[PDB]
Structures are given as structure tokens and as C-alpha cells.
């Protein structure tokens, strides 16, 4: 759609330039009371083309920033969700380790002996009766029940974007603006020494 605005603006600049035959009429009137030719066109067309192409470049810059911000946010959200699940898994592993400790470990060895005799009695060994898996599941089910409250809290629970997390995105936007604006043209270096050119560059902003 930006191309549509481009072509519309393009004709607008052309029409304003086409007005220039009006100035000649004014000169004719002054002369009556009294009792390189292509430079204007090339300059006019160049500025129109410059504004059109520059407008397109700015549109790409804005959409690209708007797209990068959202993509960067999504990446942070996936990392937040992954970290939460990783915490869950670490609790499960710690439960196994704790079970390795005392504090009601007797049944584990007893249950293992019963399951081990079964495996010996049989050709193979399967841990159908091991307590480790139910024990780990109990902790994980508690945590799962804890997280399963409602989608509303999950809105923030799943994606707990920290102030610094969003601050980083905001700083990228501000930095992107400064980079796009402070970006100055790169023409012949030792040839653009005119006072006006250096002034414009210093006040580029």
C-alpha cells in the first residue's frame, strides 16, 4: 500500500513543479509594463524520487522495528516458559536425591528387594512396582496442580516479563531510532567541506 502513497505523492510533486511555467508569466507581465534549461526538471524529479524512495525506506524501518520488537518478545517468553519447566524438572531430580537419603527410605529398599526377586524369578526385570516413579509423580503432580489455576494468572505466570526484560526491548527501539536518525550520508569526504554541508551534518540529529 505504501507504493500507492508513493505514486500519489510522486504526482503531487510533479504538479507543483509543473506550476513553474506560471513564474514565467509573471516575468512577462513585468516586462510588458516596462516602457541548463533542464536543471529545474532534473532537480525537481530527483527530489521527488528521493522523497518517494526515502518514504519507502522509512516504512521498511518502522515495520522492521515493529516486527523485531514482537519477535524479540516472543523469544523472551519462550525462554521464560522453558525456565519454569526446567525448575520443575530440577525439583523432581532433587526428590530422587532426597529419597536416596534417609527419612522413609526403608520401603524403597524393601520395595526394590520385592521387585528384584520378581525380576530374578523372571527372565527379565521391569520396575512395575518401584516407588521412585510414583514418588516423583506425586511431587510433579502437586506442582502441576499448583500451576493449573486459570488462564488469567497464566498470562503473567507463563510469561513473567521482568522490567529489565521489557527495558531491553525498549532500549533497542530507542537505539534503533537514534541509529536510523543519526545515520548520516556518506558522499565524497574531502569534497563536502562547504559550511552549509558541515552545518547540516553537525545538526543532522
Amino acid at each position: 500500500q505504501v507504493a500507492q502513497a508513493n505514486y500519489s505523492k510522486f504526482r503531487a510533486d510533479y504538479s507543483a513543479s509543473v506550476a513553474a511555467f506560471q513564474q514565467r508569466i509573471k516575468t512577462i507581465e513585468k516586462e510588458n509594463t516596462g516602457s541548463h534549461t533542464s536543471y529545474g526538471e532534473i532537480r525537481a524529479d530527483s527530489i521527488n524520487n528521493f522523497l518517494a524512495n526515502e518514504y519507502l525506506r522509512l516504512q521498511s524501518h518502522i515495520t522492521s522495528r515493529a516486527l523485531n520488537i514482537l519477535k524479540q518478545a516472543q523469544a523472551y517468553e519462550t525462554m521464560n516458559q522453558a525456565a519454569l519447566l526446567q525448575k520443575l524438572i530440577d525439583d523432581a531430580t532433587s526428590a530422587i536425591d532426597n529419597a536416596l537419603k534417609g527419612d522413609k527410605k526403608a520401603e524403597v529398599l524393601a520395595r526394590s528387594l520385592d521387585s528384584a526377586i520378581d525380576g530374578l524369578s523372571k527372565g527379565y526385570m521391569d520396575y512395575q512396582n518401584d516407588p521412585l516413579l510414583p514418588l516423583i509423580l506425586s511431587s510433579i503432580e502437586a506442582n502441576v496442580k499448583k500451576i493449573t489455576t486459570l488462564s488469567a494468572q497464566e498470562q503473567a505466570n507463563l510469561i513473567g516479563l521482568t522490567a529489565e526484560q521489557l527495558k531491553s526491548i525498549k532500549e533497542n527501539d530507542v537505539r534503533a531510532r537514534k541509529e536510523f536518525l543519526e545515520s548520516q550520508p556518506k558522499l565524497d569526504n574531502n569534497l563536502k567541506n562547504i559550511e552549509s554541508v558541515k552545518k547540516i551534518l553537525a545538526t543532522w540529529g
Binding site: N53, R57, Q59, S60, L67, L191
Partner: peptide
């Protein structure tokens, strides 16, 4: 110097602005 200015102004941009 003149040619550089003209090319700078007339630089065409084609990057396929993506729809969001």
C-alpha cells in the same frame, strides 16, 4: 561532487516491506 549528490537523491529502495 554533482554526480554523487544526484545518485544519492535518486537511490532506489526495494526491500519488499512485509505485511504484519
Amino acid at each position: 561532487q554533482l554526480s554523487s549528490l544526484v545518485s544519492f537523491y535518486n537511490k532506489q529502495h526495494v526491500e519488499q516491506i512485509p505485511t504484519i
